[PDB]
Design an enzyme around this catalytic site. Sequence first.
Site: not given
Ligand SMILES: [Zn+2]
Length: 206
Positions: A146, A152, A142-143
């Site tokens: 980013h 998101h 998830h990071e």
């Molecule tokens: Zn996030």
Amino acid sequence: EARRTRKYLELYIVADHTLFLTRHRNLQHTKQRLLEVANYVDQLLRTLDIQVALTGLEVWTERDRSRVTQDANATLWAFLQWRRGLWAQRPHDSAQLLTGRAFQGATVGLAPVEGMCRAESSGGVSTDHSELPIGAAATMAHEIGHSLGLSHDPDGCCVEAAAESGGCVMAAATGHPFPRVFSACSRRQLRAFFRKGGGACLSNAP
Ligand SMILES: [Zn+2]
Ligand SMILES: *[C@@H]1O[C@H](CO)[C@@H](O[C@@H]2O[C@H](CO)[C@@H](O)[C@H](O)[C@H]2NC(C)=O)[C@H](O)[C@H]1NC(C)=O
Ligand SMILES: [Ca+2]
Ligand SMILES: [Cl-]
Ligand SMILES: [Cl-]
């Protein structure tokens, strides 16, 4: 049909001292944990056409090399300044810290947005929060998302995975069941990111 050109993320993963202590000061088993987490990160990123190449593994057996505290953000940048020195000796695209500590503020993972490949911010920190390796991997992926400028998932994004299947990686909420795929929305954002010049360092095959 046609074949899409694969991308490769040269990953360097680090286990902090607290994670080592958590694994009963067992070096071999701490390294095994990092490898299993990286394995799940590879599975998840592959749905983005990105393959993980594990450049290096490191366990801080006696002392943390960068200050790890309850402050996720402070911990992140302290780790990133340490990453610079490491990069000179052992080049990699992204360095990821897996910690046995918990962060203040319910934070589970953190990374600089769009910092993939940048000397000052291509890395992240994640807490090994689940007994399951996929838990930390989902957080780390998830990071990394980013880091690749992925946001998101909006309202009806993520049709390729239901509740019980864990949903998609760029979901705003985290917890078991964990995600195993990135939504189509995420995939489009990534292709735009690359097209626009981001993540240039993921081009070389290790
Ligand atoms: Zn996030
Ligand atoms: C996370 O921590 C870093 C480092 O403490 C913060 O970055 C600093 O931001 C202030 C104000 O924006 C600057 O004066 C410093 O020069 C920055 N230090 C750097 C670049 O290392 C960052 O703002 C924090 N993020 C938060 C709390 O959201
Ligand atoms: Ca690379
Ligand atoms: Cl495109
Ligand atoms: Cl263009």
